[PDB]
Design an enzyme around this catalytic site. Sequence first.
Site, mmCIF file in Angstrom:
data_model
loop_
_atom_site.group_PDB
_atom_site.id
_atom_site.type_symbol
_atom_site.label_atom_id
_atom_site.label_comp_id
_atom_site.label_asym_id
_atom_site.label_seq_id
_atom_site.Cartn_x
_atom_site.Cartn_y
_atom_site.Cartn_z
ATOM 1 N N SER A 39 59.580 41.574 44.062
ATOM 2 C CA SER A 39 59.178 42.573 45.045
ATOM 3 C C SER A 39 57.650 42.631 45.104
ATOM 4 C CB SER A 39 59.755 43.953 44.704
ATOM 5 O OG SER A 39 59.194 44.475 43.512
ATOM 6 N N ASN A 82 55.250 41.905 42.027
ATOM 7 C CA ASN A 82 55.903 42.324 40.789
ATOM 8 C C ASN A 82 56.717 41.200 40.187
ATOM 9 O OD1 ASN A 82 56.527 45.189 42.678
ATOM 10 N ND2 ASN A 82 55.033 45.104 41.017
ATOM 11 N N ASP A 141 59.753 41.051 39.388
ATOM 12 C CA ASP A 141 61.081 40.913 39.984
ATOM 13 C C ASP A 141 61.056 40.258 41.369
ATOM 14 O OD1 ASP A 141 60.177 42.982 41.612
ATOM 15 O OD2 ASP A 141 61.970 44.212 41.382
ATOM 16 N N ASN A 179 56.752 50.071 47.009
ATOM 17 C CA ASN A 179 57.434 48.855 46.586
ATOM 18 C C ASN A 179 58.592 48.399 47.491
ATOM 19 O OD1 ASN A 179 59.830 47.779 44.675
ATOM 20 N ND2 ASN A 179 57.864 46.972 44.032
ATOM 21 N N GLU A 199 46.317 53.229 41.911
ATOM 22 C CA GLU A 199 47.211 52.251 42.533
ATOM 23 C C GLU A 199 46.439 51.209 43.333
ATOM 24 O OE1 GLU A 199 50.179 51.731 41.832
ATOM 25 O OE2 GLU A 199 51.068 53.643 41.198
#
EC number: 3.2.1.17
Length: 129
Positions: A50, A46, A48, A59, A35
């Site tokens: 976020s 991201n 979207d 997130n 990660e």
Amino acid sequence: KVFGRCELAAAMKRHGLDNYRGYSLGNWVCAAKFESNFNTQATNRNTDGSTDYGILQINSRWWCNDGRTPGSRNLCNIPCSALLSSDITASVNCAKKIVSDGNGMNAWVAWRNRCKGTDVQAWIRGCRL
Ligand SMILES: [Cl-]
Ligand SMILES: [Cl-]
Ligand SMILES: [Cl-]
């Protein structure tokens, strides 16, 4: 802060993550490796809108507040910035909630794709724990 591998394992254990919800310490270290490469200051935007924050790339759609993710929640009740601290307490406490949400560590797509089913104990091999 960029943690060493064993250093992070020890910090995670200190904070009760070892075998939390049945997930051995190596699972958590493996997840953090892929990660964030063990960097607490890691962020990623991201599609979207976020953002993922910290060593476990938690997130803002669900888990923390960053003020710029429309329609999102803050289920860990923390500013997303708290997930970037050299002190991993906030990331660990939030991760405990995430992993308890129903799908276990599958919540971390990178854990599913790169750690799940592998020899995760290798991530803590040699560590004084
Ligand atoms: Cl392990
Ligand atoms: Cl927001
Ligand atoms: Cl992945």
